[PDB]
């Protein structure tokens, strides 16, 4: 399964050791990824869901659930370029854009 | 550098593709790790710093800073077993223990 996550987290299923491939990708590559297979959003902030929906051209719901990844899964991760103060949630796509972000693809094996 | 992080985040330096090895470890293995080489804490919640200091027997400061990892670095990650509501910070080691956690070692190459 391809998961879309709102941070660069690697929520691995216990019981196994893993090798993870990681690379940064463009918006267009990310768009192609989420267009050509089923994805599961675990995006947990409204503004992040709104921004990802816009840049990817698909419905990225705000779905604040715990997911675990295991062998064969992939993660599209939205990685904000700064660390936020404790408890702070960025409420606008405008602020997310000014802070800046990277899109990463993690492939779990 | 060995970093101690308060979530299972993989804050990779852009400009390169990576292979990351990941496995769960015991408290004793984690203790040995942080005892035998220099570490840099980026723990960003008081209760998590207090808990890690206790279980590892070393000073794990609360140091809420952005760090990036690259080839040759390792991460000791504290991974809480549940996802928290938006903006919520767990304020007691007692609650962290009841939720439960895993310690993961990520080796970045």
Residue numbers in the entry:
A (entry chain A), B (entry chain A): 1 to 109
Give excerpts from the publication.
AFV3-109 is the most conserved protein in different families of crenarchaeal viruses. The structure of AFV3-109 is a five stranded β-sheet with loops on one side and three helices on the other. It forms a dimer adopting the shape of a cradle that encompasses the best conserved regions of the sequence. Although the function of AFV3-109 cannot be deduced directly from its structure, structural homology with the STIV1 protein, and the size and charge distribution of the cavity suggested it could interact with nucleic acids.
The protein was crystallized in two different space groups, C2221 and P3121, depending on the pH of the mother liquor (pH 8.8 and 4.0, respectively). The structures were solved at 1.5 (C2221) and 1.3 Å (P3121) resolution. Crystals of both space groups contain a single copy of the protein in the asymmetric unit. Both structures are almost identical with a r.m.s. deviation between both crystal forms of 0.5Å for all Cα positions. Strengthening this argument, identical dimers could be formed from symmetry related molecules in both crystal forms. An r.m.s. deviation of 0.51 Å is observed for all Cα atoms of the two dimers. The second (2 residues) is in the tip of the long connection between β4 and β5 and is juxtaposed to the best conserved sequence region (see further). This large conformational difference in the connection between β4 and β5 with B116 is obeyed for the two crystal forms of AFV3-109 who superpose perfectly in this region. The refinement of the C2221 crystal structure identified the presence of a strong residual electron density in the cavity, in close contact with the His45 side-chain. We modelled this density as a glycerol molecule, present in the mother liquid as crystal cryoprotectant. In contrast, a glycerol molecule could not fit into a residual density present near His45 in the P3121 space group.
